[model samples]
Target: MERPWKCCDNIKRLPTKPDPPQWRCNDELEPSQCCKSCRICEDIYWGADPGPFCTPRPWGDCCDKAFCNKMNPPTCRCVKECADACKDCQRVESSECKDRFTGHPGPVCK
Candidate 1:
């Protein structure tokens, strides 16, 4: 797999995944299940995989401009945008966080 992604302006990228990541209690406790985020990534959004794209658009935030009008309910809509914009991102649960971090620049859903 290849890691690829670009950070949107205004948001700080999250830090590398914490050494030895950990997963939620109910989740399958696996080494790969650990969670991580960059400074900007964390400031922008939060989740397991393909985390939500929390960076607001040039016009305005997703809640205001619906920058992701194509994805209705703006919140999850940005996720789709991230999928399209961020090549490393995979198409999965709109907000469930499913993909693994192949060292992609942006966040992923776990």
Candidate 2:
């Protein structure tokens, strides 16, 4: 993993200017055109909350699941998959006696 850049690390900091624009080397620069919604900012400032700014994209998650929530695409797809699995299990409850688990009731598989 690439190390994070400190705030204003690349830019000059002067006593007269409390805040300065940060500079990132070419490789560290953020992609100019993100997929409208990406969590890349989280990688910039360590432990920084994504807040409400992050948006979702159409990119598929692992296993080709569609992402619903804009802020957390992977998470959203995980939740959707879980829900779908549970719904399928419920529909087949008449035949199988195996335990059924819903999205909110069981550990994630992947």
Candidate 3:
């Protein structure tokens, strides 16, 4: 099928069948399930198959819960403080340790 979006060259159509739980495709009829965001230009590109975007991987820090809370709150409004705190935690958690030789560094903080 011809893709409507300009950056959809890599998009691959999904077959009509039961997908695994890890697949994040919300729409079955779409050409592709995943999209990648270019970190350099912030442009998005469709994936050739079902998968996640090119965003940075989560640091698995404790602040994840708080970030989610801000994302989906009872008030229906995201709290800036919550988001800031979450980002701060992620930065600290992902930073390289002082003893880089012996200690393992976390994921990209920025």
Candidate 4:
């Protein structure tokens, strides 16, 4: 048989899996790619644990702006935006962005 997804496996610093920076846990991709790692991002988001991982947008914190339209309970719509803008971030969670130690540049307008 072929190799497994390798997502559920312990991740360090590899091209496959990843390591989180904070409970901020900003190193996972979508459930398609990162699997558990991806869930970790969402975990932090709605779970409101460490807050969403942000890459930082130019137009006034896209993380917040991403959630702007959602008064019905506004959630991490930014997750989509965050990931869209952050295909290459080391520490981003589809949310508010910040000064980069390693992260996405931020934002993706609707």
Candidate 5:
């Protein structure tokens, strides 16, 4: 619904969070247990409400280097995966579904 992280980033300022998650960007990076959970959640719009998604890839390879959320050109995970969300999420090239689901996609993402 919102994000510092997602498919299910249940870090709701926490009173308790471990009902299903244990690690992600090391508890969403900042001293710990402040965030995480999303085993693969690519909206493939790959833009925001946080962009990219796995348990948001095995919860980012289970950790380190990305003691933080890590996603880098592994074709950016899948869920509408037009080889990474229809080439920057809306560029079906020549238009079909109203510029591929219109949110004002004129030239698209720079």
Candidate 6:
């Protein structure tokens, strides 16, 4: 199966400035899009708390599965590890521009 976030090269980050015309999802209306809802839930649910995020049926189903579980070439594990590293950076930085630096683009997997 094709990957879900292939449009964004499978990398999670804040929406770009001036937003790419095709960068969108969750509706057929937009040609290319990332499911922001799923992306946010993926970041929070998988990394930290599952909470009420994983409920109400279909939408909550992602909790039971990793977002990148079916990723081609099996890159989800690496991506998860990268996210973990970012989390570590956040912890180390504590409060000083942690958000800005943690998610700043850098080598995720060599």
Estimate TM-scores for all models.
Answer: 0.14, 0.15, 0.18, 0.18, 0.16, 0.15
Candidate 5: clashing pairs of residues: 38-55, 38-56, 39-54, 39-55, 40-54, 40-55, 53-56, 54-57
Model 1 gets an lDDT of 0.30
What clash count does candidate 4 reach? 4
lDDT of every model, 2 decimals: 0.30, 0.26, 0.25, 0.32, 0.28, 0.26
Residue-by-residue lDDT tens digits, candidate 5, 1-110: 33445333322212335443232221333433333334332222222232233232322222222222123322122212233223344445565511122111111123
Worst 10 residues of 5 by lDDT: 97-106
Question: In angstroms, how far off is 31's CA in candidate 6?
Answer: 5.7
Residue-wise C-alpha lDDT for candidate 3, range 30-81, written one tens digit per residue = 4343334321222222333333222212222112122212222221111122
Better of 3 and 4 by lDDT: 4
Residue pair clashes in candidate 2: 55-70, 56-70
Query: Which candidate has the top score in lDDT?
Result: 4
lDDT of 1 by residue, 25-109 (tens): 1212334323254321221233333322334322222222222232323323323444322334445655541222221122222
- After best superposition, candidate 3 residue 16: deviation in angstroms? 15
For each of the candidates, the C-alpha root-mean-square deviation to the true structure, in angstroms, is 15.8, 15.3, 14.2, 15.1, 15.2, 15.6
Local accuracy of candidate 6 as per-residue lDDT tens digits, 1-110: 22233222123433444332122222223433333445322321121111221112221112223223344343332111123223332223443311222111212212
lDDT of 2 by residue, 36-68 (tens): 234432333222211211211222112333323
